[PDB]
Structure of Carbapenem-hydrolyzing beta-lactamase KPC:
Amino acid sequence: HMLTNLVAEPFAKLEQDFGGSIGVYAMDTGSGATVSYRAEERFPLCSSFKGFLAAAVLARSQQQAGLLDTPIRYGKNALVPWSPISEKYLTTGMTVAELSAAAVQYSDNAAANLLLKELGGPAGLTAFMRSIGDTTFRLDRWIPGDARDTSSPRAVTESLQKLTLGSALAAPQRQQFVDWLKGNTTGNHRIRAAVPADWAVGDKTGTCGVYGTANDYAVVWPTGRAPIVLAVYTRAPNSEAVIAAAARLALEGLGVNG
Ligand SMILES: *C(=O)[C@@H](NC(=O)/C(=N\OC(C)(C)C(=O)O)c1csc(N)n1)[C@@H]1N=C(C(=O)O)C(=C)CS1
């Protein structure tokens, strides 16, 4: 608590301007300082579960030789809307690793469904999160304030730190997870818009419908100092700009010059 919100930032006003709810957690892994605004509230995961899904696939690959290179063929019935990579390989198949990269880097929806099958579904992914110490994450599916398919900004950040910088994955798989996040293409207007171009950054986004429920989590490597891990989640007013604005406030609250 002593290193949390050492520097106040105007998150409440940003949230009022947005009209919905915003949740933010950011940690400076060098000092332990944090910034936290609604950080323990539940927000919809939307597609952000797919980063953790890819990590779970990598963890499984430590025990299951050949998993990543396994070819997966699927039918047209698997191609739900917003499957921009998998729809181009319907007639050929894709490997598990390719599906993972597509889920992470293009938020390919069909690819994520196919990988969830590999893990035994939402409960399997939830079990992986429990296995790394995350008691908040819940994926339920394949209501106002619906708790299904939610986590908190804090738990998302803590789990992201364990997987990308800590020991939850073996080193080769950790670096592959980082590389997948670094190559994401869907986040240029979110956390990345608050981060200087000469800093490395990996992220995964989520967008639930068009009304402003959206999110992003990222690892950021400022040059010359320890990495920062952060998560920004929103619930729509009854947003891409708001996420970037909240990330800027989080970095400012950590004293990180951008
Ligand atoms: C993950 O968040 C995916 N999102 C969706 O499939 C949903 N909506 O997609 C759009 C295109 C916004 C829609 O209005 O249909 C959705 C609605 S409710 C729910 N649980 N998901 C993909 N991921 C991203 C991202 O930001 O990573 C998108 C930009 C949309 S597709």
About this structure: Residues 46-47, 82, 107, 109, 186, 205-210 surround acylated ceftazidime (CB under 6 Å). The chain has one domain: 11-254.
